[PDB]
A paper describes a structure:
Here, we investigate the effects of increasing laser power density on the light-driven proton pump bacteriorhodopsin with a focus on the K-intermediate that accumulates just after the excited retinal chromophore returns to the electronic ground state.
Reference difference density maps were recorded at 0.04 GW/cm2 with a nanosecond laser, for which direct multiphoton effects on the excited state are highly improbable, although the 13-cis retinal ground state may be photoexcited and return to an all-trans configuration. We further rely on pairwise comparisons, for example, between the highest and lowest laser power settings used at SwissFEL, or by comparing femto- and nanosecond laser excitation under the same fluence at SACLA to reduce the impact of other experimental factors from measurements at different facilities. On the purely structural level, our results show that even at the highest laser power densities, the overall conformation of the K-intermediate remained basically unchanged compared to structures obtained using nanosecond laser excitation and freeze-trapping experiments.
Numbering used by the authors: 4 to 234
Write the structure that this text describes.
């Protein structure tokens, strides 16, 4: 599996997601607060899922060849199986933090599923020009998600416990910056215009994935906002 130059970044991402999973797992031992237990369960599952998908890419299972532009292009499809389950869980962490209504949550998860789903179709589309149609629809779904997090949650977090509002605003800022980089990497990477080579693209996604899953988890699980206000 070492014939692919990007293997070094897949192995490092695999290791980092594995160590993050174990850290959150041990850290969650003994926590009895029901509210904190919810956040630990959601947040520990995120790197655990990504660990299995990074391992599958390292071993070569999560890779396929897609013909477009007159060439057989290597497409790591396992990323979308990862994101299909981890991006909803990350949104749920934010929504539960601000106690969002059930209707708003369904809208976020539904739009998230469309965003990843259309991204997958664009990744496997064989007509080159059609790949960017799916990219545009996926990006429009992400912009809807970002809009809700700003003009829907922020207005309700400010009316909550101060520790909750401060942690949400930090995680919301982190989320907006990191998530917005994904469509850009896709567009200029091997899946899109092919300006950046695959080995560099893999490096970019690895830094983003670890930050958005482990880094995001470190900020949340160290806050007092996940525990109920008790004496
Ligand atoms: C916090 C501690 C960790 C901090 C570390 C964060 C590093 C992330 C930086 C990445 C971009 C890497 C850019 C490397 C560019 C090499 C490209 C190259 O030389 O070939 C390109 C090819 O010719 C086509 O133009
Ligand atoms: C080298 C290590 C590689 C990386 C590790 C391999 C990951 C795959 C294995 C196991 C799933 C274990 C459980 C995952 C679910 C975590 C949920 C949790 O622990 O939540 C605690 C909550 O407080 C309770 O009520
Ligand atoms: C709260 C919700 C929790 C959700 C927990 C779910 C986590 C499942 C994780 C991983 C395995 C992913 C395996 C995906 C199966 C792909 C197999 C396939 O279709 O391969 C086709 C063909 O054989 C080859 O290209
Ligand atoms: C809308 C309400 C919520 C506001 C939230 C603010 C965050 C906005 C950020 C990003 C969208 C992603 C933009 C990605 C489009 C990049 C395409 C591009 O410009 O590429 C040019 C050229 O092809 C290469 O040199
Ligand atoms: C696991 C970490 C996070 C933050 C994953 C986020 C992924 C996305 C925001 C992906 C977006 C895409 C779009 C909108 C357009 C191209 C296809 C993608 C699925 C990469």
């Amino acid at each position: 599996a070492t014939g692919r130059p990007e293997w070094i970044w897949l192995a490092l991402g695999t290791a980092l997601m594995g160590l993050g999973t174990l850290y959150f797992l041990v850290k969650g031992m003994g926590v009895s607060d029901p509210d904190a237990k919810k956040f630990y369960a959601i947040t520990t599952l995120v790197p655990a899922i990504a660990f299995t998908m990074y391992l599958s890419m390292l071993l070569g299972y999560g890779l396929t060849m897609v013909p477009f532009g007159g060439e057989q292009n290597p497409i790591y499809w396992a990323r979308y199986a990862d994101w299909l389950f981890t991006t909803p869980l990350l949104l749920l962490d934010l929504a539960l933090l601000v106690d969002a209504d059930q209707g708003t949550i369904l809208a976020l998860v539904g739009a998230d599923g469309i965003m990843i789903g259309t991204g997958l179709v664009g990744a496997l589309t064989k007509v080159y020009s059609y790949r960017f149609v799916w990219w545009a629809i996926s990006t429009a779904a992400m912009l809807y998600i970002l809009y809700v997090l700003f003009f829907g949650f922020t207005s309700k977090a400010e009316s909550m416990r101060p520790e909750v509002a401060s942690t949400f605003k930090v995680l919301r800022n982190v989320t907006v910056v990191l998530w917005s980089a994904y469509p850009v990497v896709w567009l200029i990477g091997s899946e899109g215009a092919g300006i950046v080579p695959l080995n560099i693209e893999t490096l970019l996604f690895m830094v983003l994935d670890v930050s958005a899953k482990v880094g995001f988890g470190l900020i949340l699980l160290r806050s007092r906002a996940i525990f109920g206000e008790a004496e």
